[PDB]
Design a protein around this ligand. Structure first.
Ligand SMILES: N[C@@H](CCC(=O)N[C@@H](CS[C@H]1c2c(cc3ccc4cccc5ccc2c3c45)C(=O)C(=O)[C@@H]1O)C(=O)NCC(=O)O)C(=O)O
Ligand SMILES: N[C@@H](CCC(=O)N[C@@H](CS[C@H]1c2c(cc3ccc4cccc5ccc2c3c45)C(=O)C(=O)[C@@H]1O)C(=O)NCC(=O)O)C(=O)O
Lengths: 209, 210
């Protein structure tokens, strides 16, 4: 397999790049790191920012989940059709990362006391992405342009995990709702998402979702 | 008018690095300053994609998200590596820079008094990967990636400049990083920009903390 993915046995910051490789018919290796293995210190000390994921592409090793998404976007042609689209692609992925950051902060540092508050604020947090779809061909294609980009898989993941956190959170957003259904129905992505290596992986590392 | 417009609060903050880029690249831009007053009104905010600043315009292209603007300028002014391999390492640096900038703004705006000692203690460990990155590329005598400047350099540089203000001498433990800052700061147009009242007379953050 041209690609290697080193990460803990969770979906987390690897779900989107996983969705992408499967969807792009790519092949890759999963190097599963257990807490035990991680608690060791060897691997971690060896990681550039002391964290996972880590990714190998030939002699090339990267860290940072967003660096890996952009690298696959760049090499596989999932980064807009021009410099203008790339920038919008970036604007989406940055917004996706901003909400992801609030998501993991809830999950791992304040689930029980800030969840209601988090959910009260969700729609306002999701509104920008339906607005983005509303300005791109009535939201019938992809988040940016009429070609899929790495940011699509990243936003897809973010939407999927929020549906679990706050079911029906999408019900007020028709374009978002339909985008999820449409992307999830792409065959390879479909089979992947229905696969045990996805389905039987928890979303986060602490059992909350 | 300049084809570039920067819409921001009167602070360095998340616009410092991209202004350094533009200054250093001899590019022209307009600054549109936003007071709290104005922001407090809500019409601007309502109109911002993610309800925040900065807001950037390149002709009729409007961008949000500071790192989106850096990559856009990096893309257009050829500050994004020599090849695709370099482009990814550049991204990898910038992601690390953002990750630390995120901890910094949290300290500055939500836990300065209580958190500052612990922040300064953990700082060397946060700075080390960049020292390591320089030590792996021309012994740190060039740029953070390869032998040509990139948007990650300006963002990293700013990151190091503000940490020198919050933790004076913090780079005394990282010779490569220290030399780097002295080198880049010495580029004629950047040095010029950095000593100018347009940069100097802006506070780093919006709450009077640094
Ligand atoms: N900017 C980087 C961030 C990379 C990152 O955060 N990595 C984490 C695991 S990813 C993931 C993640 C986080 C927190 C935790 C916290 C506990 C945890 C316990 C058991 C399994 C996992 C698996 C993943 C994971 C986490 C766990 C969350 O913070 C994350 O943001 C992610 O959602 C990690 O390596 N932690 C070990 C450690 O620092 O020494 C990127 O974009 O790639
Ligand atoms: N992911 C985005 C982040 C953009 C962002 O955070 N913008 C902030 C100001 S930027 C800046 C910033 C933050 C907090 C504050 C808090 C108070 C404050 C008071 C007066 C002036 C400024 C100016 C900047 C600024 C802040 C202030 C900090 O949170 C930031 O991280 C930055 O350092 C904003 O617009 N706040 C208005 C509001 O949400 O209603 C990006 O990279 O572009």
């Amino acid at each position: 397999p041209p690609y290697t993915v080193v990460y803990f046995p969770v979906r987390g910051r690897c779900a989107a790049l996983r969705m992408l490789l499967a969807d792009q018919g790519q092949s890759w290796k999963e190097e599963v790191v257990t807490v035990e293995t991680w608690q060791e210190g060897s691997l971690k000390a060896s990681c550039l920012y002391g964290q996972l994921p880590k990714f190998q592409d030939g002699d090339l090793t990267l860290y940072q989940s967003n660096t890996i998404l952009r690298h696959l976007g760049r090499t596989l042609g999932l980064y807009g059709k021009d410099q203008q689209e790339a920038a919008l692609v970036d604007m989406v992925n940055d917004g996706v990362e901003d909400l992801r950051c609030k998501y993991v902060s809830l999950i791992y540092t304040n689930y029980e006391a800030g969840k209601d508050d988090y959910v009260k604020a969700l729609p306002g947090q999701l509104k920008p992405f339906e607005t983005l779809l509303s300005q791109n061909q009535g939201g019938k294609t992809f988040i940016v342009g009429d070609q899929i980009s790495f940011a699509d898989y990243n936003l897809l993941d973010l939407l999927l995990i929020h549906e679990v956190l706050a079911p029906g959170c999408l019900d007020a957003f028709p374009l978002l709702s339909a985008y999820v259904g449409r992307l999830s129905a792409r065959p390879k992505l479909k089979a992947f998402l229905a696969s045990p290596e996805y389905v039987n992986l928890p979303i986060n590392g602490n059992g909350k979702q």
